[PDB]
Amino acid sequence: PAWEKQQRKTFTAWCNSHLRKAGTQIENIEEDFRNGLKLMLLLEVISGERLPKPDRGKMRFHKIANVNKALDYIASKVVIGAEEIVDGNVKMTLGMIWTIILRFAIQDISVEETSAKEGLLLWCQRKTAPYRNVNIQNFHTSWKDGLGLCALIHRHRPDLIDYSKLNKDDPIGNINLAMEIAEKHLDIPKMLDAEDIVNTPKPDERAIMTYVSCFYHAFA
Q: Are residues 99 and 134 in the same domain?
């Protein structure tokens, strides 16, 4: 049930990490993409392609037309109705944004003949190989104690963190410490809530994949 809250936080932070490059931000993902304008902008920033010109009209049919420019573009890149987005359907909006994250942050990742989600997982497993207290098997329970994230940072930037000093006792601090370092030194905004991750039996993998993908791109 806490999945919506986790996706809202993380997907909003991810969107904002890109929209800032176009001079704007969103705040409330359940309403701020209704008119399609910032959704089109997001797609342009992350794809590097131009979309058709937006319609700044205020009525429903103007919004449908903008949202279609976005959905039709997405459909051209990936192997839902505009009304769902224009009507502020929360589940469908989060689903649409996951589609975008998966396509533009994750799909093109390729490591050892392994692509997309599976490729990002293999990369994480390769980079955390040296750490005996880490066992990445998935994008949920494997990341709960914060050591995985800390290890990703240490593997590339041992100047930024003393990994030996860490252990499983303080998962909340482990997660926050990684996020603080990433924000301060890797230009990666904080996209998770440490409390939610630790206190949920199975954290939301879409949220975790989103954040972890930012580390992949920072270090590539």
A: no
